[PDB]
Write a protein that binds this ligand. Structure first.
Ligand SMILES: *[C@@H]1O[C@H](CO[C@@H]2O[C@@H](C)[C@@H](O)[C@@H](O)[C@@H]2O)[C@@H](O[C@@H]2O[C@H](CO)[C@@H](O)[C@H](O)[C@H]2NC(C)=O)[C@H](O)[C@H]1NC(C)=O
Lengths: 234, 102
């Protein structure tokens, strides 16, 4: 998994997301895009898979978009019980969907994802519409959260996150490549097609990549864009 | 080949929750049994007996709305609900292969 958020010079915020899944080819056949509608209006959209009614890559059209990366640290043996415990205590995919349904603004969604409570370790990447409205939320072991927002005035116009931390994070070829590619393309004139170039660079795209998607919640037709922006890889 | 976009669906929140995913399940019914069988293999074997036991207690983890959706999904797919609940809770169990640790 690779989640990217970038704000260009014009102020547009782009959310790119690659989903890497070990059970790659079977999942491609059941990858779907969904519009959740109520009273004839799209409340929120998301990518999911047949049998899964939660959302891990989704958008509140016009307001914000969100993607969740699993977070894998060492000592999987030592902590497996605690991992299963928090996953049952607060189901992750349905928590995300509940936020998309009941939180209307970027600021409201970021606070909901930052509440101090049991939550499975993960990275929640949220993209907005206003300035610096792009954040990586680090859900830590096992109830705290840290936020790392955009700082365009400090020349911090993009955020990239995958699945790891500590040494393994700094050595992730997916994360390193995406950061190099964003710097090559540069902040100015960075658009959704630039995000497509980044997400398609090897090894950001790799043998386990199920789909690549781009979300721009700030667009006046963000729902229409998201409905055709996802690519199931061959 | 050239158009590799995911199929689009509208999930009507005004419909009863047990009926919302009918069309999605009907369109992918061919693939669902193999996905389930292959996903379960990623759960560590020592913890599989616990997952199935805990997953039957569906009323403890989800709102009534989500409960009815999961039950509707299990009815339309013809697959045991405990397995469907387990996969949804262990959202990343098949994302990152960790069976070599066991
Ligand atoms: C998508 O599905 C195809 C379809 O294959 C089968 O379809 C169903 C009837 C059911 O039996 C599924 O479990 C099967 O997958 C997949 O193509 C098959 O891939 C497997 C891989 O080992 C192979 O054994 C089969 O011979 C393949 N069948 C054909 C007709 O080619 C395919 O792998 C899935 N993924 C993608 C990306 O298409």
């Amino acid at each position: 998994c690779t989640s990217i958020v970038a704000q260009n010079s014009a102020g547009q915020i782009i959310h790119g997301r690659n989903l890497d899944y070990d059970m790659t080819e079977l999942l491609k056949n059941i990858t779907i895009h969904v519009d959740f509608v109520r009273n004839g209006t799209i409340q929120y959209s998301g990518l999911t898979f047949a049998l899964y009614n939660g959302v891990l890559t989704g958008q509140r059209p016009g307001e914000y978009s969100v993607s969740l990366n699993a977070r894998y640290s060492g000592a999987y043996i030592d902590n497996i019980l605690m991992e299963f415990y928090t996953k049952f205590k607060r189901p992750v995919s349905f928590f995300i969907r509940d936020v998309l349904e009941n939180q209307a603004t970027y600021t409201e969604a970021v606070d909901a994802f930052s509440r101090t409570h049991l939550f499975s370790p993960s990275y929640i990447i949220v993209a907005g519409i206003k300035k610096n409205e792009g954040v990586v939320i680090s859900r830590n072991r096992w109830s705290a959260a840290n936020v790392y927002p955009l700082n365009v005035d400090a020349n911090q116009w993009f955020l990239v996150e995958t699945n790891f931390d500590n040494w393994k994070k700094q050595g992730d070829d997916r994360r390193i490549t995406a950061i190099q590619k964003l710097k090559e393309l540069g902040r100015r004139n960075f658009d959704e097609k630039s995000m497509v170039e980044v997400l398609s660079t090897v090894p950001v795209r790799n043998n386990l990549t199920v789909f690549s998607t781009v979300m721009v919640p700030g667009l006046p037709d963000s729902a229409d864009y998201f409905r055709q922006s996802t690519w199931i890889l061959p | 080949k050239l158009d590799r976009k995911p199929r689009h669906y509208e999930i009507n929140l005004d419909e009863p929750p047990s009926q919302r995913w009918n069309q999605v399940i009907k369109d992918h019914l061919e693939y669902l049994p193999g996905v389930v069988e292959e996903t379960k293999k990623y759960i560590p074997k020592p913890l599989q007996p616990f997952v199935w036991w805990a997953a039957s207690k569906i009323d403890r983890y989800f709102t009534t709305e989500i409960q009815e959706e999961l039950k509707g999904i299990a009815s339309e797919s013809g697959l045991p609900i405990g397995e469907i609940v387990g996969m949804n809770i262990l959202y990343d169990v098949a994302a990152f292969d960790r069976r070599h640790i066991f």
